[PDB]
């Protein structure tokens, strides 16, 4: 049924009113106290960069980039785990790497349950600037796939 109205994604569903989101299929008195509870208990978890000496950056000198996971929603209890027979806590990989070279240039694991900071340092070559993309990828949840293309140096 979404196939054939143009919606796939989860945020193309919950933008909708409490009667569109049951105005699309069937609906239950225990699907909305389990719906509405997943959908709170997902990361709602946006992006921050920041980075410094983005003109003044040669070639052998290292730079760090710093990544604030600004979360705009309260952690109340572990990720929901239906099928999942361990009640595992969520972690964060906010990695950065290149987007046509295939190479990854840094990776570390993250556990916040609020804003946090995480900082990571690396090695750019010579040849001017290089563009790099910066992901952050969970263990947990879809759906937060997102995604920044820049350039230094």
Not at 37 to 45: E, H, K, M, S, V
Not at 55 to 75: A, M
Not at 95 to 113: F, H, P
Request: aromatic share 10%.
């Amino acid at each position: 049924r979404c196939t054939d109205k143009g919606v796939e994604s989860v945020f193309d569903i919950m933008e909708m009113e409490d009667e569109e989101r049951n105005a699309l299929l069937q609906l239950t008195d225990s699907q909305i106290a389990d719906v509405a509870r997943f959908c709170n208990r997902y990361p709602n978890i946006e992006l921050s960069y920041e980075v410094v000496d983005k003109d003044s950056i040669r070639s052998g000198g290292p730079v760090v980039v710093l990544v604030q996971l600004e979360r705009e929603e309260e952690v109340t209890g572990p990720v929901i785990a239906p099928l999942f027979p361990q009640k595992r806590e969520e972690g964060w990989w906010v990695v950065i790497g290149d987007a046509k070279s295939n190479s990854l240039i840094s990776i570390k694991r993250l556990t916040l349950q609020q804003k946090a900071k995480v900082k990571l340092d690396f090695v750019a070559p010579a040849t001017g600037a290089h563009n790099y993309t910066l992901y952050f990828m969970s263990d947990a949840y879809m759906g937060c796939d997102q995604e920044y293309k820049f350039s230094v140096d």
